[PDB]
Amino acid sequence: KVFGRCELAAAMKRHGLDNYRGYSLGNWVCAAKFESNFNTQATNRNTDGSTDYGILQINSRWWCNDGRTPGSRNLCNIPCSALLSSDITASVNCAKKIVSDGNGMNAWVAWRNRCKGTDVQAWIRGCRL
Ligand SMILES: [Cl-]
Ligand SMILES: [Cl-]
Ligand code: NA
């Protein structure tokens, strides 16, 4: 599924991401835009052989099991394919654990490089929430 920008903002708000750990909704929409272009089916392989999954590009090195990242962990206790569903619940629940692990949203490179320090409220402008 390829979300509309306001559609995704509304789905994230319902799932408790607005203000989660102090990160307003615009930050999460911004990160999703640049990580996956709002596409739940996005996958990208990393140099170390791990893969990033889903609309927040969660990494199999630490967070999910894809059966092909030797020596990796599965801290979110999920198959990585659950991160590609049209239902964003599993991605959101796992992102909540990531952003709480001490490093906030700096875990998402695109957030650090393209959202941090910008007017992220622009990403939820005009949406009915
Ligand atoms: Cl915001
Ligand atoms: Cl980047
Ligand atoms: Na893993």
CA dist 16 and 32 (Å) reads 16
Annotation says 52 is catalytic? yes
Structure determination technique employed: X-ray
Among 52, 66, 87, 119, the active-site one is 52
**Angle, helices 5-14/25-36, rounded to nearest 10 degrees:** 130
Paired tokens of 21: 């750990």
Instruction: State the resolution, in angstroms.
Output: 1.7
- Contact between residue 34 and residue 112 where contact means Cβ atoms under 8 Å apart: no
Dihedral sign, Cα of residue 20, residue 11, residue 59, residue 73: positive
Phi, psi of 2 (to 5 degrees): -105, 110
CATH numbers and ranges of domains, the chain:
1-129 (1.10.530.10)
Q: What angle do CA 57, 61, 62 make, to 5 degrees?
A: 85
- Contact between residue 63 and residue 75 where contact means Cβ atoms under 8 Å apart: yes
C-alpha of residue 103 to centroid of ligand 1, in Å? 19
DSSP 25-44: HHHHHHHHHHHHTTBTT-EE
Paired tokens of 96: 């909540």
Paired tokens of 78: 């999920």
- Contact between residue 123 and residue 29 where contact means Cβ atoms under 8 Å apart: yes
Return all residues near 109 (Cβ < 8 A) that are at least 6 apart: none
